[PDB]
Amino acid sequence: GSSGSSGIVMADWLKIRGTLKSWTKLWCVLKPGVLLIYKTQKNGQWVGTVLLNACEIIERPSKKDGFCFKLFHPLEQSIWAVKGPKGEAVGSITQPLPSSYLIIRATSESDGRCWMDALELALKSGPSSG
């Protein structure tokens, strides 16, 4: 359980696999048993939401490439919310994304380590349980 103050877990600029050509620095928001992603913090067109009902982290720092990881579902499920924050199918239409897994990138091994870590906790934190 992460008793910081607000429901949200953490928010930072994470890099996503550059399927277009260059990694995309989206605004990922770590929530309690959920993760949100937004094109930016300013406007915030929203990209999609990730569900952490019971996802795990394996990590993928690769040989030499800062630090990264992969969050997939062991019970083979959809790691995507039916809607979004404001109950919306989708916000914007950008690069393609996965369904089961989700590759993310952090700034420094630490950051990522905290991300890939918090995540594990988040899911292991449940949606405000008690």
Burial of 39 (0-12, 13-18, 19+ CB in 10 A): middle
- Measured distance CA(24)–CA(55) in Å, rounded: 23
Write out the two tokens for 120: 């594990």
Question: Among candidates 44, 56, 53, which has minimal Cα distance to 116?
Answer: 56
SS3 56: strand
| Contact assessment for residue 115 and residue 14, using Cβ atoms and an 8 Å cutoff | yes
Write out the two tokens for 96: 């393609």
- Measured distance CA(37)–CA(79) in Å, rounded: 13
Write out the two tokens for 34: 């959920």
The structure was resolved experimentally with NMR
Q: Is the dihedral of CA 90, 46, 13, 50 positive or negative?
A: negative
Q: Which residue has the tokens 């950051």?
A: 111
> From residue 65, how far is each of 68, 108, 111 by CA, in Å?
8, 10, 14
Question: Among candidates 76, 66, 74, which has minimal Cα distance to 110?
Answer: 66
Give me the CATH code for the 1-130 domain, please. Answer: 2.30.29.30
